[PDB]
């Protein structure tokens, strides 16, 4: 019933990061894929946008092979942007 954008955000970042740990060393190439996994698991307000767009972009624009931990730790506090459009 109740859906919260905040809880959806936390779940989003967490599921992305938890996904990226399966692909370790290849992470930079799998960021988008794992993001869609988080979007589809935690649900989204807009199917197109995903659970947190800003996070996806920040990560995809930062994550390097075996750089995961610091990348996620720096990207999870970022603003999700607009969940609608």
């Amino acid at each position: 019933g109740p859906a919260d954008c905040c809880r959806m955000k936390e779940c989003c970042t967490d599921r992305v990061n938890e996904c990226l740990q399966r692909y370790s060393g290849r992470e930079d190439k799998f960021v988008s894929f794992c993001y869609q996994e988080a979007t589809v698991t935690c649900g989204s307000f807009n199917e197109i946008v995903g659970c947190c767009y800003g996070y996806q972009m920040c990560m995809i624009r930062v994550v390097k092979p075996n750089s995961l931990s610091g990348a996620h730790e720096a990207c999870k506090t970022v603003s999700c942007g607009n969940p609608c459009a």
Partner: protein, 146 residues
């Protein structure tokens, strides 16, 4: 621990006594002046910065930057060409050149996708469709005839 933030006089009341890095990079966007892609505004002489330009590529630049989350600076290409490699000097000219030699971080413009460029640079999936076409003067309406 405790520290003095100021003092109180019999008159002056409350008097407060005594008491840079980590920033995001500006992305340089190279574009060419072609209508209706990038055009100067009517009053652009009185305006400065990215408020000078208006067009499809301008709006697309704004959107792309907003999605990717970077501060962008629109800059027209120096030589005024799209891109090419001189068969002699093997040197790239135009926007493609400014990408290869790192004069610009990204290129948003009517840059036609060609294999020759695709080898030296990265092209996003096409944001617009086109093809070589023929232009002639609009014919006279003439007459119905006998």
């Amino acid at each position: 621990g405790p520290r003095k933030i100021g003092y109180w006089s019999e008159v002056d009341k409350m008097v407060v006594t005594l008491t840079s890095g980590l920033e995001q990079k500006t992305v340089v966007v190279t574009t060419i002046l072609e209508s209706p892609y990038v055009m100067m505004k009517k009053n652009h002489e009185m305006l400065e910065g990215n408020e000078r330009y208006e067009g499809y590529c301008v709006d697309l630049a704004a959107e792309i930057a907003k999605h990717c989350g970077f501060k962008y600076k629109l800059t027209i290409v120096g030589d005024g060409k799209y891109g090419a490699r001189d068969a002699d000097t093997k040197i790239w000219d135009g926007m493609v050149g400014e990408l290869v030699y790192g004069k610009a971080d990204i290129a948003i413009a009517p840059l036609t996708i060609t294999l020759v460029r695709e080898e030296v640079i990265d092209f996003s999936k096409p944001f617009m469709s086109l093809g070589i076409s023929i232009m002639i003067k609009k014919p006279q309406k003439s007459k119905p005839g006998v």
